[PDB]
Amino acid sequence: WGYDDKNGPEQWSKLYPIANGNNQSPVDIKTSETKHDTSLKPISVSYNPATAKEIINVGHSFHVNFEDNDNRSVLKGGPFSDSYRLFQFHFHWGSTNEHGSEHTVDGVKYSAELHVAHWNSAKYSSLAEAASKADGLAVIGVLMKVGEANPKLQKVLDALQAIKTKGKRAPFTNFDPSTLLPSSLDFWTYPGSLTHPPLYESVTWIICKESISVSSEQLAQFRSLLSNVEGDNAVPMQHNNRPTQPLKGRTVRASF
Ligand SMILES: NS(=O)(=O)c1c(F)c(F)c(S(=O)(=O)CCO)c(NC2CCCCCCC2)c1F
Ligand SMILES: [Zn+2]
C-alpha cells in the first residue's frame, strides 16, 4: 500500500471499503463553516524526551516511534476527557512545494504536514486495542508552509542518512516532539480516520491554526528518502498525502 496509481488512495476502497466512509480524513476545513465551541479546553502536551525510541523507513514514509509502556508522554485537554499516550510522529509531503499537506484550509494546500499520534491509555491497554476504537486515537496535525528553514527539524533530518532505504532503522533518542509544534496551540477538531490503510475511523483530529515553516531544501531531504530496499534501483519517496475527503455532515469545531 502506497501512493502510486496501483497501490494508492484510489485503490484502497477495494480492500478497505471504509475509504468511502462517513468519517474519513483528511478534510478541507472551511473556516466559515466551523463552529466555535466553548466546552473545548486548551491542548496540553507533556512529553518526556527519554521516550523517543527509533526512526524507521517504512517505504512510503518514515516514522519516529516512542516507548509507550507508560504515561511519561501524554496529550490532554482540548475535546478530551482522557489522557492520550504519545506513540509516534511522522510527516506527509508532496511532489513539489505547492501541495503535500493532508489537511487543507479554505482550499489552501501547504507543502507538508506533521502528525503527532497518540492512543487512549485511559480506556485501552495497547495501541493495537485502541487503533480501531472511535475514541482510540488522537492525532495533532501541523501544516508546514514552505519558507525559512526550520531548525527544530534538524535532529530528524540529520537522522535520515541512516534510514535511506525501506526497512532501515536506527535509535532516535532524547527528543521531545512538542518542540516541533507552533507557538499558538489554537486548533480545529473533528472526528475522522487514519489517512492510510486501514483507514479506521478512530481518530480525533487536532489541527493547529498556526503553521510551522520548512524550507525548500528540507522538503527535498524528505523526498530523497527511498522507497526501495537496499541494492535495488533507487526510487525516491516523492509524495505520501491522501486527497481531502467529504465532510459528510461532520462539524469542524474551532477552539478560537
Ligand atoms: N496519517 S495517520 O496518522 O493516519 C498514519 C498513517 F498515514 C500511516 F501511513 C501509518 S503507517 O505508516 O503505520 C501504515 C499503516 O498503518 C500510521 N500508523 C499507525 C496506524 C494505526 C493502525 C495500527 C498501527 C498504528 C500505527 C498512521 F497513524
Ligand atoms: Zn499521518
From Swiss-Prot:
> Key word Flavoprotein present in the record?
no
Name a GO molecular-function annotation.
arylesterase activity
Family matches, as PANTHER family: CARBONIC ANHYDRASE, CARBONIC ANHYDRASE 1
Organism whose genome encodes this protein: Homo sapiens
Protein name per UniProt: Carbonic anhydrase 1
Which reactions are catalysed by this chain?
A: hydrogencarbonate + H(+) = CO2 + H2O; urea = cyanamide + H2O
InterPro entries registered for this protein in UniProt: CA_dom, CA_dom_sf, Carbonic_anhydrase_a-class, Carbonic_anhydrase_a-class_CS
Query: What does the record give as EC number?
Result: 4.2.1.1, 4.2.1.69
- What cofactor requirement does the entry state? Zn(2+)
